[PDB]
Design an enzyme around this catalytic site. Structure first.
Site, short mmCIF file in Angstrom:
data_model
loop_
_atom_site.label_atom_id
_atom_site.label_comp_id
_atom_site.label_asym_id
_atom_site.label_seq_id
_atom_site.Cartn_x
_atom_site.Cartn_y
_atom_site.Cartn_z
N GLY A 1 -1.42 -10.53 8.95
CA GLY A 1 -0.49 -11.41 8.27
C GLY A 1 0.77 -10.72 7.81
O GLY A 1 1.20 -9.73 8.41
N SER A 2 1.37 -11.25 6.72
CA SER A 2 2.57 -10.80 6.01
C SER A 2 3.91 -11.08 6.72
O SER A 2 3.98 -11.32 7.94
CB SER A 2 2.48 -9.33 5.60
N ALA B 1 6.74 -9.88 4.19
CA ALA B 1 7.52 -9.44 3.03
C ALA B 1 8.07 -8.00 3.22
O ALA B 1 9.25 -7.87 3.54
CB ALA B 1 6.72 -9.63 1.72
N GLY C 1 6.58 -5.76 5.52
CA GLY C 1 6.39 -5.60 6.95
C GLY C 1 5.35 -6.54 7.52
O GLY C 1 5.32 -7.72 7.17
N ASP D 1 5.22 -4.35 -8.51
CA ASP D 1 4.96 -5.58 -7.78
C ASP D 1 3.55 -6.11 -8.00
O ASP D 1 2.90 -6.59 -7.06
CB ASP D 1 5.31 -5.45 -6.29
C1 LIG Z 1 -3.37 -12.44 0.61
C2 LIG Z 1 -2.09 -11.67 0.41
C3 LIG Z 1 -1.39 -11.31 1.70
O1 LIG Z 1 -1.12 -12.15 2.56
N1 LIG Z 1 -1.07 -10.01 1.85
C4 LIG Z 1 -1.30 -8.92 0.91
C5 LIG Z 1 -0.57 -7.69 1.45
N2 LIG Z 1 -1.46 -6.66 1.99
C6 LIG Z 1 -2.75 -6.82 2.35
C7 LIG Z 1 -3.18 -5.61 2.82
C8 LIG Z 1 -4.55 -5.30 3.29
C9 LIG Z 1 -5.27 -6.21 4.06
C10 LIG Z 1 -6.54 -5.88 4.46
N3 LIG Z 1 -7.15 -4.74 4.13
C11 LIG Z 1 -6.47 -3.89 3.36
C12 LIG Z 1 -5.17 -4.11 2.94
C13 LIG Z 1 -2.07 -4.74 2.64
C14 LIG Z 1 -1.92 -3.33 3.05
C15 LIG Z 1 -2.16 -2.96 4.37
C16 LIG Z 1 -2.02 -1.65 4.77
C17 LIG Z 1 -1.55 -0.69 3.88
C18 LIG Z 1 -1.25 -1.07 2.58
O2 LIG Z 1 -0.83 -0.05 1.76
C19 LIG Z 1 -0.60 -0.35 0.37
C20 LIG Z 1 -0.48 0.93 -0.41
C21 LIG Z 1 -1.60 1.60 -0.89
C22 LIG Z 1 -1.49 2.77 -1.62
C23 LIG Z 1 -0.23 3.33 -1.83
C24 LIG Z 1 0.91 2.67 -1.37
C25 LIG Z 1 0.77 1.49 -0.65
C26 LIG Z 1 2.13 3.45 -1.77
N4 LIG Z 1 1.55 4.57 -2.51
C27 LIG Z 1 2.36 5.64 -3.08
C28 LIG Z 1 0.19 4.55 -2.56
O3 LIG Z 1 -0.51 5.38 -3.09
C29 LIG Z 1 -1.48 -2.36 2.14
N5 LIG Z 1 -1.01 -5.39 2.17
C30 LIG Z 1 0.38 -8.28 2.50
C31 LIG Z 1 -0.33 -9.52 3.04
C32 LIG Z 1 -1.18 -9.27 4.29
#
Ligand SMILES: *CCC(=O)N1C[C@@H](n2cc(-c3ccncc3)c(-c3cccc(OCc4ccc5c(c4)CN(C)C5=O)c3)n2)C[C@H]1C
EC number: 2.7.10.1
Length: 277
Positions: free
Chosen positions: A21-22, A24, A26, A142
């Site tokens: 998905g997403s 926002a 990426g 966020d």
């Molecule tokens: C329902 C909401 C929605 O549509 N979304 C939430 C958001 N999203 C979901 C996911 C995710 C899906 C499944 N399994 C795991 C995660 C993520 C996501 C995906 C990949 C990486 C990611 O990284 C976030 C992050 C973690 C830790 C750190 C950072 C970023 C930055 N720093 C410094 C960290 O230590 C998140 N995102 C979007 C959509 C799908």
């Protein structure tokens, strides 16, 4: 002594299998991480940021990840851990796959079957994760119910923290000082936490529905806040209101919110009134 777990990944070493998905920061994909020289195939989520970036800009992201994603040393059960990063014409973040999605979708889909014990426990867990972020001096910027992920219906985790400090707009979740002057602190995260709690208590209702984002600061200056959710007693609503004081220093601390919500979690039917508990 305790090592820094973040790994720099090659374009090989991981594959994107399906779009999750997403639209926002990426695009998120489900995939596999195959650490080279090992025999494990780990199911991961892969976020590929939409912006382009250059080899020099990627080095600044790397410098920020080294300051940021490293100083999350022991880990927290309610905080998502960045497993890897790959910078090569795109910025890609790799975390453990969470098949059950976000808490925002979960509360909307299970509106008629969610009890007070679950709702109050998620408030405890989000505050524990946010307190852990505060201890490591990381401002989330966020926090919202869409950025809380479901490991199990009884175990949630915060994701997407510091995704602004990595290199360089949710107005309805932002503290007044963030809207007006872009000041972000652990206390502006407390405001967003209060809006996140409101989202859960309203089963995923949109904050300030039908009100333009350009009007929010003047409404907050006037003194208006998000309304008291139907299931909320004055007790839970008062905690939310404290999260939205103009004076950031008058708002609760995440450490105090863990204690308040854990006390309410011990007797949940007293604090939330849901048809069916
Ligand atoms: C329902 C909401 C929605 O549509 N979304 C939430 C958001 N999203 C979901 C996911 C995710 C899906 C499944 N399994 C795991 C995660 C993520 C996501 C995906 C990949 C990486 C990611 O990284 C976030 C992050 C973690 C830790 C750190 C950072 C970023 C930055 N720093 C410094 C960290 O230590 C998140 N995102 C979007 C959509 C799908």
């Amino acid at each position: 002594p305790n090592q820094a777990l973040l790994r720099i990944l090659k374009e090989t070493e991981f594959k994107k299998i399906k779009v999750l998905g997403s639209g926002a920061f990426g695009t998120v994909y489900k995939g596999l991480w195959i650490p080279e020289g090992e025999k494990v195939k780990i199911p991961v989520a892969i976020k590929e940021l939409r912006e382009a970036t250059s080899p020099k800009a990627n080095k600044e992201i790397l410098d920020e990840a080294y300051v940021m994603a490293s100083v999350d040393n022991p880990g927290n059960p309610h905080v998502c851990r960045l497993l890897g990063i790959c910078l090569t014409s795109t910025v890609q973040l790799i975390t453990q796959l969470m098949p059950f999605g976000c808490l925002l979708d979960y509360v909307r889909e299970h509106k008629d079957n969610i009890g007070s014990q679950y709702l109050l426990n998620w408030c405890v867990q989000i505050a524990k994760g946010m307190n852990y972020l505060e201890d490591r001096r990381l401002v989330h910027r966020d926090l919202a119910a869409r950025n809380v992920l479901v490991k199990t219906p009884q175990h949630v985790k915060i994701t997407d923290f510091g995704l602004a400090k990595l290199l360089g707009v949710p107005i309805k979740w932002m503290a007044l000082e963030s809207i007006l002057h872009r000041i972000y602190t652990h206390q502006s995260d407390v405001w967003s936490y209060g809006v996140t709690v409101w989202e859960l208590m309203t089963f995923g209702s949109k904050p300030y529905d039908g009100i333009p984002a350009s009007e929010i600061s003047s409404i907050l200056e006037k003194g208006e806040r998000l309304p008291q959710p139907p299931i909320c007693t004055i007790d839970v609503y008062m905690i939310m209101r404290k999260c939205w004081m103009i004076d950031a220093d008058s708002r609760p601390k995440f450490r105090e919110l863990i204690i308040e919500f854990s006390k309410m979690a011990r007797d949940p039917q007293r604090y939330l009134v849901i048809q069916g508990d």
